[PDB]
Amino acid sequence: ELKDELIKIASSDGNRLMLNAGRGNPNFLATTPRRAFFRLGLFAAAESELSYSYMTTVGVGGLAKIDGIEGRFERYIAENRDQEGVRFLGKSLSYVRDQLGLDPAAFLHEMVDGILGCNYPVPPRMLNISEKIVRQYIIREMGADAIPSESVNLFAVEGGTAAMAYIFESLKLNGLLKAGDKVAIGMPVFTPYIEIPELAQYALEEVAINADPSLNWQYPDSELDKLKDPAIKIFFCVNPSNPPSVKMDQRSLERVRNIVAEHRPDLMILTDDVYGTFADDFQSLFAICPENTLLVYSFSKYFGATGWRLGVVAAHQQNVFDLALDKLQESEKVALDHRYRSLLPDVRSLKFIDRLVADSRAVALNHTAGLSTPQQVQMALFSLFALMDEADEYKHTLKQLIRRRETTLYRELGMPPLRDENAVDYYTLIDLQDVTAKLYGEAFSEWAVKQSSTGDMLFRIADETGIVLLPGAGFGSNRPSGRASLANLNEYEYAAIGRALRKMADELYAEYSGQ
Amino acid sequence: ELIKIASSDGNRLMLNAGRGNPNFLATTPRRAFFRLGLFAAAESELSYSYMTTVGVGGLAKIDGIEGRFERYIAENRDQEGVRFLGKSLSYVRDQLGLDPAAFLHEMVDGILGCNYPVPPRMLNISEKIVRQYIIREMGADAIPSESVNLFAVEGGTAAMAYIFESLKLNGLLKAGDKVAIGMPVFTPYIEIPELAQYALEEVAINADPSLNWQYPDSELDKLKDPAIKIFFCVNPSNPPSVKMDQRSLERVRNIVAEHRPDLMILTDDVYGTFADDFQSLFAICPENTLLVYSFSKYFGATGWRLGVVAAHQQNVFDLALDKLQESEKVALDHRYRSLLPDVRSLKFIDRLVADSRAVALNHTAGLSTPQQVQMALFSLFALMDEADEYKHTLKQLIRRRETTLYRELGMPPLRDENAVDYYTLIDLQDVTAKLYGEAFSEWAVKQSSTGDMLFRIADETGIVLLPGAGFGSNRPSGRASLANLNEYEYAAIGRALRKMADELYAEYSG
Amino acid sequence: SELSYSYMTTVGVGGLAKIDGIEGRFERYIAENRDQEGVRFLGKSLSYVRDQLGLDPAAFL
Amino acid sequence: SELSYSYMTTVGVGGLAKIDGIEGRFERYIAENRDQEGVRFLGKSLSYVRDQLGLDPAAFL
Amino acid sequence: HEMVDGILGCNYPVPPRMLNISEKIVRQYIIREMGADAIPSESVNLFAVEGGTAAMAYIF
Amino acid sequence: SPFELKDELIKIASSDGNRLMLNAGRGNPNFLATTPRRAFFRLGLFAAAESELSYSYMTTVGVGGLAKIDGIEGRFERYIAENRDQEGVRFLGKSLSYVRDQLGLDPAAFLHEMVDGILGCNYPVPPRMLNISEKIVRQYIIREMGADAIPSESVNLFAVEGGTAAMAYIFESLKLNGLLKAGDKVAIGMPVFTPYIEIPELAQYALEEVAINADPSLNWQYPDSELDKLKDPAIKIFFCVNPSNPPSVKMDQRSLERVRNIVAEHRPDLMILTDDVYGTFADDFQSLFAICPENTLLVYSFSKYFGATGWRLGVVAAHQQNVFDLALDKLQESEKVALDHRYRSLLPDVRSLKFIDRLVADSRAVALNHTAGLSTPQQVQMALFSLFALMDEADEYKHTLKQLIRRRETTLYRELGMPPLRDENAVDYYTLIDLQDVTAKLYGEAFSEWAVKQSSTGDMLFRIADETGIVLLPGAGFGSNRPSGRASLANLNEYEYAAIGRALRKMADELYAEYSGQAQN
């Protein structure tokens, strides 16, 4: 509720994004894979222009010809060696042809025809080579070191935002989730993911799997164990988490692996892993229980591409969603036979991830559904950018940047809180007791806590810096605390938040020092 | 049989979705996009404060943007795209009178795709630009630009998908309801409404071939039935490919203003610009019409997935909304509770957006900012081409293609002011009549069959035409698109069709 | 002038020079052309008018 | 400095640089020389001074 | 190749009546400007000659 | 069969690289150092201009004279200034400074050797190795062998055409100088590739090989007991490839110190002949040449590390004071007189002719010694590869290559339980794919053991050669009883490694399937 008055004191689209959707829009962006996208376009347009047969000054192209594409492409690569984006395009060619072993002419054609976006995505679910390019990036950054590439299929959608909207709808229409079914949600999570299941169109009952502060926001075993209840149809999780911003740990990952393995082989897991790369040796639920999990991976935060709206829905070639589909009643299966009659002859063989594509645009419009070709191409380039960066220079650069900002934030707050291996810190929690105790001791700590309120703290900082933090969610109001993103502000702004919260601390301390 | 005889991507798009994919595309606004981006990138690289070789950037600053943008333009006068961007700044700053720095930062930030679209229905300066183009091309020459709002979506495909779902959701279309579809129309549109998701009853408004595929008054009049809650139209039409004439437009404006002021119109005018002096049902009855305009066919931008849902500030979808039972009002109030305090004030165009992403994610919904920027730029291109040079170039390409197509079939059918002809109807009777007489005309039709013809043509050239539909199968006929093949391909289609005609005439002769 | 023409044409039509940002553009022009005596003169006269006469440079330009 | 000298001399004399329009002229200089190391450095230092330290960009330049 | 070999003038014209692709390119132009929108491009054969002057000489 | 499976294997899969692995037991790198090569070609252009500067008549023909050393630094620096924007050129310029400022050598002299050298217009002088290239290449060598205690003036090199020509040269030389005679006992670190096994066992030499078998359960390190087998005075020469091929590991500190005592307190007359081509691929390599500089003849190749197999660049290193010369000091007057008449045309006190210089003389039938040595352009390309590794202080090139190898290792073991645990003595230019270890990782030790009996190296390599086109090196070295194959992580691309892995996982799921059926019975 303090949210309404916070926005008033401080107004900026960013601050709103944080309070309305609960995300920090990044102030950083992968430039190289973008420059290449643009250079690939200039070359693409030339390829277009080569095919227009008439004399006009108006500016019309024909479709790029696949014949002799390598030769022209290479000629392009050579004449522009001093342009950042062209060198990348070139290496990228090598990687796809040489390391992945796909057809180079076909790769070039998919990329050129794609960024011209003069053709409907085909197949609808995701372009042929891009899927294979993007899936190798996914597996890797998800920690799926054992899953064979061919066993993983992707559906390219418009951000993780379109993902959740498409999944929940498909789960309802396909009777894999009905009103009354219990949904286990790893909490805390941001509001949008609490609201969706509660909507009247879904009417699902949620079961909190609560993260524990004492465990650095890991889900204790007793908590995970709740999934044993066979009534829980699915486990909705955001990992690494937002707001806590920590990745689930080993214990937690085996815990679930076992529950699924020995008690709930039928359970559906739905995990959102956008912050994965910001973690250290991330391993996704998808990697631990691939056959039971639907992955939603967005390129949004890692590449500073929120505006691009790029994400994928990944599913194992063999999974429980299709299983649950066969376990449906003849009567339900007969009605779905009508629903997808047009997609193909044997609807009982239509895999769930293909139903996601069909359902996203009413089905009758399948052949023209799918994420835009130019969008997919930019996705394919982000993927390549990561894969070819063997030393992880880009990843390290961002992680040291989050750290520099953290260093600046707590400079006057008693340095950052101790960081362990499960830490991500895309959002960092500024707790008043912990800051005061690190500055003036645990006595003053317990007394300062009682003297203020989250709103108090937030309002004051919002008033002295214009920056509005996110109230501390996760451990019973007992604790004054806010959350900041270490990805959306610049250093002097993190200096100001911390300078302000010191002054408040020096004041809280002056009071305590005179009785 | 004839199902694989011909296999390809174009052949499948036509057979599987009644669409001809254009083999032309507007390149200046595209070259401008990529050029815009290069510049955008430099802007990003200016805000990165650390020594690196990794390839990182911050966000472009708006402060000093025009100045730096002018240097970029001055520096590259010699690149087609740069010239256009520069001209487009003047059009926006000078003719639309918008803020120049704001326009530029929206475009730079917009194409770097580094922020969520805000607002979600459509970036601000882009909507004012695109609606300016919409109004012009839809011939809505009397509507005040400000009464028109657009929702930026992923082609006509997301729109139809969005609208129907939002109409069910808000009870503006309930089961048992009647939907007047303008026929013939391609398959996907007969399907959506017959999906059990909605369960409505279709009411065909049949175009008349004797009328040159125009909707006869008796048929338009069917619309008077108050059981018809919505008129579903693709205009210009597909497969007929003609534009409703004035008599028609007018006939309907009437049925609305004098019998059905409650009627809902859903019109898809993606082919508008290929018609001669197009006027859309949204221009005739702005308060009763949801327009759906796709950029796909005209700029040859199918892969880009760019379109808009336009709605008049004051319209019947919102009026209808204020007429539901409190029962339904209270349930909607709960649905969109997270969106705003007074849910009863939420305009229907805005519910589309929210319903497009399960409501709870409305804050992050909307079309990608890079797409929207490409859209603004396609719009700017048309808008700045006062002489319609582009339009003419395409219109003559279509005709050129038609001439080559019919060279050996009696020459293309008589043109009409309502002809668009993005799809052309190759009728067997009319072609043998022009070639050998009314007498052979009649014998030949009875002699052959639509499947038979499509085969001879397919088996011989590999292209498979759409079966001529819309007038009692007694007429063997097929439709080809004059937009997706090069001349020698149409030459082959006709060569094979005349080969057939000859053999049937050899017979008659005997 | 051509900077203010808003339409697409090959005929050769310009619009009215805008004062806004004129210094920056003129200054860019002077730099890009330091080897043409005419430009070396335009730049110094901008200094005279603004620096010695105390007048307004954007107006002068 | 040369932009601040008002008279025609061939002796090489300049005047005090002006703080007006300075970010813009500096930005043309940078873009105009991205291939000269020291220069890319200068560009980034402005961002560092303007973006991370939050100090006045034109006063800095 | 027909145009590169041809502008070099290094081979005798083959076939003698007229080069292959030029004949096809030229007849397309001849049917357009002579207004023969009913005649199929492949029903027309051309004999490349040195101006109308050469044309009449040969024909008579 | 070992010598029969090889021939049939060569059939199922033909590819130049596959044959190389089978016919030479070598893995030809698909990576190569470009900066030193561009540096080279561009020095070539500078040098051609330096040559044209000296031709005195008019022509269009394209003739040039010898390059003049006078004023060469000025011109070189002009050339360099005028080309800062080309990669190799930047490189060239710094190397001049490395040679000048860090090695303290004469710059005009350095440049002239490089210019004159790459033009190949003079006979190598001295034949053994060009003066400055020798002092450069040895700095590289000393560093990369971990010979961190051996003053440089003490090491000499003989530029030869790869470690392939170094061996042919060294065995014949040992023979002709009587340091190695028929039936002499030559000890060989094992396992080792077939070539180094056939040579000493040739009728020309007829020596007796004494296996110094490596121990699988020891990660292929040689156990004290096997090493100690060198105290036998009947053993005249310890022949060894380190880091090993195919075990692909470097002898640890223990094994190195072992041999150290064996030479100080028991065998000071022992002759060590070590091939250390894969040294740079190991973590902190130290060569036996580092450990016993005067008992060793180091044969170092530039092929694998720089991706120069086709350049054929190699050096033979020997300490000034070494046991090959002592041994020639100890020959009977009788034999020394026979030598005096072989190397007479070379020098007056043929008894002073050092062994390493006999290496040169011998290679070209003595009479031709003044026109012997590696080609000047090759020695120059050799000096440029050396400068390159020496100037790269952070070892980026080396890290890049190690990381490439590890990447290929991960792609390969992806469906096999991950690569086996690495050591500190691990090089892995070649990696061992052991069916017992894989099956054990995937399905446990119980299965592991049943598998090893159910299969064969023959079985394994054929499934893989069939399914992927890749033919592996039969796993050699243990109580055979272990189906296993070797691959090089240096001669294929990722998707091929994945192909190999995929094939093997299939094979183990298949065995496990049979094993599962049987157990549940």
Ligand SMILES: *Cc1c(COP(=O)(O)O)cnc(C)c1O
């Ligand atoms: C920021 C964020 C995303 C991004 O979603 P996109 O719609 O792909 O931009 C997804 N989930 C969570 C938990 C986030 O914090």
Ligand SMILES: *Cc1c(COP(=O)(O)O)cnc(C)c1O
């Ligand atoms: C070609 C076409 C469109 C465009 O489809 P998008 O989803 O916008 O690509 C729309 N409607 C009809 C009737 C068409 O034939």
Ligand SMILES: *Cc1c(COP(=O)(O)O)cnc(C)c1O
């Ligand atoms: C000018 C003219 C020509 C041209 O003759 P060429 O021989 O082809 O130059 C032909 N016919 C007529 C009647 C003319 O007036």
Ligand SMILES: *Cc1c(COP(=O)(O)O)cnc(C)c1O
């Ligand atoms: C590859 C290899 C060589 C290199 O031989 P060169 O003739 O120098 O190319 C030498 N020894 C072994 C152990 C090898 O594996």
